[PDB]
Design a protein around this ligand. Structure first.
Ligand SMILES: C[S@@+](CC[C@H](N)C(=O)[O-])C[C@H]1O[C@@H](n2cnc3c(N)ncnc32)[C@H](O)[C@@H]1O
Ligand SMILES: Nc1ccc(C(F)(F)F)cc1N
Length: 256
């Protein structure tokens, strides 16, 4: 049994109250108050559509993934990663795909900086899409489940689906469950072929063990995974630590 599986069993035993006190203990988060009020009022400039813009921004500002050229955003949802990339000087085009419909978020039209190079398409299940030529491959898909065997399947399916979209490109891919042994096996194989490293984002909640496979980095995957499992187990051992609360991102306005 992996440390992550022990973390998973403990998370599943939590009451709603304990889960709610655990999920943001010691994490980092952006203050969404201003963006939510603006979005409610139909404002189309400055605001990020979701917490995702700040989440991807954390990797980009650390040079872990450097978006350039034609960017593909798989599972774009409302479009947080797509509107963020649209404002980056090296980026020429942003194509976002998302499933939509019941249980899924629809793209939100915005007029933030670089909006004119963005095309978000709903009704697109990536597991049925042929791969396209692109310079940057982004993927934020992976639905949590109380079952880590369900999550193992979902994770391996994402890893296999993204691979042909990967051919010497910049990339940032969510790995929903990186602790299951069969997931580690695939990740090690992918790292030997495409390089990169698994990174834990401080804006991720404690209720998910997600890590992101980014192109610009190196390291031991197993080691990084176990450090996350230890971190998340340690966060059950003490009273809730209020999160670091930061300013949300300003995505500006106008065309590029
Ligand atoms: C975690 S959200 C992405 C949030 C996004 N990065 C942002 O910044 O707003 C993942 C999204 O993937 C979508 N999704 C899940 N499975 C999908 C699939 N098979 N094809 C396309 N989109 C999918 C979900 O509907 C959801 O909107
Ligand atoms: N995104 C989305 C689209 C359509 C529906 C519907 F009302 F038809 F069920 C629900 C959701 N959540």
């Amino acid at each position: 049994e992996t440390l992550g599986e022990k973390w998973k069993k403990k998370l599943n035993q939590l009451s709603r109250k304990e889960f709610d006190l655990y999920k943001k203990s010691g994490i980092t988060e952006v203050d969404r108050t201003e963006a939510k009020e603006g979005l409610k009022r139909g404002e189309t400039t400055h605001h990020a559509v979701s917490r995702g813009s700040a989440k991807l921004q954390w990797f980009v500002e650390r040079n872990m993934v450097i978006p350039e050229g034609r960017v593909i955003d798989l599972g774009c949802g409302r479009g947080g990663w797509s509107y963020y990339c649209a404002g980056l000087k090296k980026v020429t085009e942003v194509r976002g795909y998302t499933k939509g419909g019941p249980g899924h978020e629809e793209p939100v039209p915005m007029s933030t900086y670089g909006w004119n190079i963005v095309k978000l398409m709903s009704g697109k299940d990536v597991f049925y899409l042929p791969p396209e030529k692109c310079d940057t491959l982004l993927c934020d898909i992976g639905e949590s489940s109380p079952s880590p065997t369900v999550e193992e399947s979902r994770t391996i399916r994402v890893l296999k689906m993204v691979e042909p979209w990967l051919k010497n490109n910049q990339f940032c891919i969510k790995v929903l469950n990186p602790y299951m042994p069969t997931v580690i096996e695939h990740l090690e194989r992918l790292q030997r072929k495409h390089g990169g490293m698994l990174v834990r984002n401080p804006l991720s909640r404690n209720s998910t063990h997600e890590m992101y496979w980014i192109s610009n980095g190196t390291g031991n995957i197993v080691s990084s995974v176990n450090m996350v499992s230890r971190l998340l187990l340690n966060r059950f051992t003490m009273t809730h630590r209020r999160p670091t609360i930061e300013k949300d991102v300003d995505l500006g306005a106008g065309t590029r």
